[PDB]
Design a protein around this ligand. Structure first.
Ligand SMILES: Cc1cc2c3c(c1C)C(C)(C)C[C@H]1C(C(=O)O)=C(c4ccccc4)[C@]4(C(=O)NC(=O)N=C4N2C[C@H](O)[C@H](O)[C@H](O)COP(=O)(O)O)N31
Ligand SMILES: Cc1cc2c3c(c1C)C(C)(C)C[C@H]1C(C(=O)O)=C(c4ccccc4)[C@]4(C(=O)NC(=O)N=C4N2C[C@H](O)[C@H](O)[C@H](O)COP(=O)(O)O)N31
Ligand SMILES: O=C(O)C#Cc1ccccc1
Ligand SMILES: O=C(O)C#Cc1ccccc1
Ligand SMILES: [K+]
Ligand SMILES: [K+]
Ligand SMILES: [K+]
Ligand SMILES: [K+]
Ligand SMILES: [Mn+2]
Ligand SMILES: [Mn+2]
Lengths: 500, 500
């Protein structure tokens, strides 16, 4: 099966790419696996596959860390993401995000139901598993529980059957047959939960599938629109209908090749302790246990020699940056274009801890709008900060056509030199805020409201007659013939490969 | 003579360090020398010494580019700066800035007058030179003149004789015997000019010395206090009295080993076209000629085989970042401490185009002040933004003790995650602004006023009971024994020098 459609094949792809380290000696799921993975993420090393996990019994489970993290070389920096999508390993960020957006004006390709698949190779009923007995990792030393769920896909469906959502949200072991996890507005798992709570009749039928098709976990991490079933979006993106099998204990459908499947319910009434957790912005607040949603597990099915993917998230660079930030930026780009705003590109700079998005402006189009900074900033911030795709983003930086938004150094240069603090900014206090940013949930103001800004790094003439500067750089401040001469003579004079 | 006390010896030091490329074939001062130097600065390559400059006649002149730019290795990143100061080439930024501040509570060591020196080896009177005939570089393709002066020291003295200032300010050739240049408030060359203009009797006696003692050019680039003669500060810093010779045509004194000396006057009445110029923030606005101060040159003296230092400034990284930003940050650190503010360290991040300074706070001391963010931000911004040392800096970022302000990645992380836009900031509109930042002089508001901000990246408990988080990083989220095990087993497992 192709790597983008089968997790097991994706692991083989990473080996083939010389992007995997198999560790066959005993590794402790209590911190050691996550510490190795953390080190990998901070140094852009090869993904670790822990084949000999202390506590693994009856096939549950091996761990793959860092599934969507960065490679060291520039040329295939984003190769792990490209391997989620059937793209060449050298694919650019622009190409990856375009692939993730391509299904947005395609007819969905609904999934195909098949009678069985590898995820049914083994099963454990209500009398045979105990989640406290599995080798669930402790990811960070102060975490409030063992976070089984960092890279699986929650599956919930609207009461009326018309929308089946796939998404990543964290969850930790509560007891032998329950998890607790984040289920928070405006996320789709929360929106669907709310529908079931209002109906008031039953808990939410649920499944959590780990080691799903890589193209599916990418869509699970993207804020595609309300009401859109991810399976059909992934079908359209990949050009193929995804093969799903029915759960044993409910009528939800899971990818046929899922490594591990939990079946059960998301309670409409109960909660339990959840967190603290070392989160995407790089922090844990030890002891800040909060209450989270409560899941009951009724059944486990799994592949022979099942592999659990794990994100050891925190400081740069991991899945929470590469996928959350970039996929939100992609959706934001499209949302802006659909609202008639002249945005060509969007990216969440890693330097911002993916709390900013830089928006590249087609300034020819801007000039024809005959507008001003104040007006344009307000328009852009109203579109983005009032939408779910803007939830995680607290600062938008508007830049003109000379800036490559995928290059954080150039975004930082433009921000620092073209946006006058205060005057060239509009603050938004009456929008939903993201509590997980420390200055929100652990800060001086309301955790859930405000703290957002549009920073205009367009220069004045970009609105009127055109750019009126040249950069004082090698590229722009010397003629072409001279630049080439310099390059041609560089090593000869005594100064000094793409792949590496 | 020691490298920090003699420019010629400094050039030999750079050779010895394998940090020099001598170019002995013809190089054009029209753009080519500066293009090579620009390329060096953008890639942290070896400094170029142009020994065969097209247009050099009768010993005037060779060029050394990139005298204070960065080296490629981490271990001796700042080695060129260290060679200005007699420090080991591995010296840290903290050590360099401490050396630059050390003279601030030492008695000055006044200079020693000697009867002659190498700078008197050759001379050209009023009938023998023509500045338009020298190989003065065109540094950037749109510059409004040939900028002879990018790394020499202007020498002017108060009318009463009590203060002799040494400073870097740009200047370009106007005609055969005049320059134009920046002389702007609040700079000391401007403050002294104003004194002469108010007296109204004569033009300002002036000298411009190129290839001065490296320790002197560092002080020339630092905002040491009003009224303080740089020569005595450098004497105290180096522990030695600097040897100076008298000018021939006025009673100013120049370093004995200066490569090239211009003697003349700074007019109290005349101006001429100055700029545009590719400046420290990375921009040129072609055609924006402004008027600048006008200098008359009466005499040139110079060393045999004289060398002109040149800064090919603009985008990262050159002297305008390494020296302007870092030396302003050093002075700011001291100013804050002298105003009883609990600041341990300051640095201007390169990522900010040296428009920010990050201030590291001793949070034990902060807690004892029993204050709040609003109050503390206002106090800090009042101290810094009302002082000349704060002139170039438009954003201050307050960070706690866990952040190394010399590491831009960590400053950016803290800023992005700990400072809530708006609420955790205080804007300053009634302070002097820096017009050279594009969003000031070419922006939407007053060029000379406002646009400054204090951004508080201290978390709430840092004011009260202490830090209440741990980072989700390898360092902080795993015990010491486990971290060491991981490191010890890293290459064995299959993953992977300080000098490189
Ligand atoms: C990739 C990823 C992702 C994610 C995550 C992760 C990962 C790896 C982890 C590791 C697990 C971490 C975590 C976090 C932390 O940080 O902890 C987080 C947060 C983030 C943001 C926000 C808030 C929270 C999560 C949770 O928990 N919750 C939620 O909610 N979400 C989320 N995410 C996101 C998501 O996925 C999106 O958003 C879509 O979009 C969904 O879908 P829809 O369908 O709804 O649209 N997570
Ligand atoms: C290192 C360096 C330095 C500098 C410079 C340079 C260099 C290399 C060049 C290349 C030439 C460039 C230029 C610029 C540009 O960018 O163009 C500039 C600006 C800068 C800022 C500001 C405004 C301007 C200068 C001019 O021009 N002017 C002035 O004013 N200044 C200045 N600087 C600074 C200085 O030096 C300090 O500030 C002290 O401190 C002084 O002293 P006192 O004594 O007064 O204190 N410059
Ligand atoms: O209570 C909410 O709406 C929330 C939240 C949150 C928690 C942890 C990490 C990210 C968001
Ligand atoms: O007119 C002033 O006060 C000024 C100025 C300026 C010009 C160019 C680069 C930096 C400062
Ligand atoms: K999703
Ligand atoms: K602007
Ligand atoms: K100075
Ligand atoms: K703060
Ligand atoms: Mn969804
Ligand atoms: Mn001075």
């Amino acid at each position: 099966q192709p790597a983008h459609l089968c997790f097991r094949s994706f692991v083989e792809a990473l080996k083939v790419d010389n992007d995997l380290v198999e560790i066959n000696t005993p590794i402790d799921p209590n911190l050691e696996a996550a510490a190795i993975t953390r080190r990998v993420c901070e140094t852009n090393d090869k993904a670790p596959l822990f084949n000999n996990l202390i506590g693994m019994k009856n096939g549950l489970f091996r761990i793959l860390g860092a599934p969507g993290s960065l490679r060291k070389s520039s040329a295939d920096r984003y190769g792990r993401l490209a391997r989620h999508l059937a793209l060449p390993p050298t694919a650019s960020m622009r190409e990856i995000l375009d692939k993730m957006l391509s299904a947005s004006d395609m007819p969905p390709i609904p999934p195909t139901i098949v009678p069985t698949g590898p995820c049914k190779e083994n099963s454990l009923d209500d009398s045979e598993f105990d989640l406290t007995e599995l080798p669930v990792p402790l990811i960070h030393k102060s975490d409030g529980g063992k976070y089984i769920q960092t890279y699986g896909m929650h599956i919930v469906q609207s009461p009326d059957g018309t929308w089946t959502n796939w998404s990543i949200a964290r969850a930790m072991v509560h007891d032998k047959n329950h998890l607790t996890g984040l289920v928070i507005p405006p996320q789709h798992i929360w929106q669907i939960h709310q529908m079931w709570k209002k109906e008031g009749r039953s808990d939410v039928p649920w499944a959590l599938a780990f080691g799903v098709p890589p193209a599916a976990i990418m869509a699970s991490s993207m804020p595609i629109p309300d009401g859109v079933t991810e399976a059909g979006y992934v079908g359209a993106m990949t050009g193929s209908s995804l093969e799903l099998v029915k759960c044993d204990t409910n009528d939800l459908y899971v990818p046929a090749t899922s490594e591990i499947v939990l079946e059960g319910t998301l309670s409409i009434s109960e909660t339990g302790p959840e967190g603290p957790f070392g989160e995407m912005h790089g922090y844990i607040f030890p002891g800040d246990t909060h209450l989270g949603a409560k899941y009951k597990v009724n059944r486990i099915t799994y592949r022979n020699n099942a592999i659990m993917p794990m994100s050891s998230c925190g400081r740069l660079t991991d899945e929470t940056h590469t996928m959350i930030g970039s996929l939100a930026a992609a959706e934001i780009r499209k949302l802006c274009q659909q609202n008639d705003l002249p945005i060509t590109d969007a990216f969440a700079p890693f330097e911002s801890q993916v709390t900013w998005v830089a928006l590249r402006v087609d300034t020819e189009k801007l000039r024809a709008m005959k507008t001003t900074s104040e007006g344009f900033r307000k328009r852009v911030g109203d579109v983005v900060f009032n939408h779910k795709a803007g939830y995680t983003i607290h600062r938008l930086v508007l830049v003109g056509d000379d800036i490559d938004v995928y290059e954080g150094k150039d975004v930082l240069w433009a921000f620092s030199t073209r946006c006058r603090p205060g005057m060239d900014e509009t603050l938004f206090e009456d929008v939903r805020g993201f509590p997980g940013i420390p200055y929100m949930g652990h800060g001086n103001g309301p955790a859930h409201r405000g703290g957002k800004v549009v920073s205009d790094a367009l220069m004045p003439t970009e609105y009127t007659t055109g750019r009126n500067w040249e950069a004082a750089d090698f590229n722009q401040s010397y003629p072409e013939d001279l630049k080439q001469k310099v390059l041609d003579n560089w090593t000869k004079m005594g100064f000094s490969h793409h792949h590496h």
